[PDB]
Amino acid sequence: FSASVWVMMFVMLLIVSAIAVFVFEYFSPSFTIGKAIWLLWGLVFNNSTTSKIMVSVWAFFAVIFLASYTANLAAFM
């Protein structure tokens, strides 16, 4: 139904989350270890200062991925 290769997107998500955490840590000049992961996983999915707003542009990719996933799940049956 989705991720036919099963090895590309599932590691792309991990690496993009890792680089997001890295840049969030680099933006120090709230908690990088705990809050960044929670906000990343609560922003892409419905279930759940200045630096967060400027990096909130990832919501475009989030909504695109959600729409693609739901369309694939509805059209592959």
Binding site: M8, M12, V23, M54, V55, F60, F61, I64
Partner: protein, 36 residues
């Protein structure tokens, strides 16, 4: 899988990374100007 959804993802990924690279320096310069 194929080029279709790889490209449709890489276009927006490049856009997002370029925006991240530009906005960081832009806001850094804005903060430096504000706190000159």
């Amino acid at each position: 899988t194929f080029e279709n959804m790889a490209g449709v993802f890489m276009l927006v990924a490049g856009g997002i990374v370029a925006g991240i690279f530009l906005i960081f320096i832009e806001i850094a310069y804005k903060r430096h100007k504000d706190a000159r």
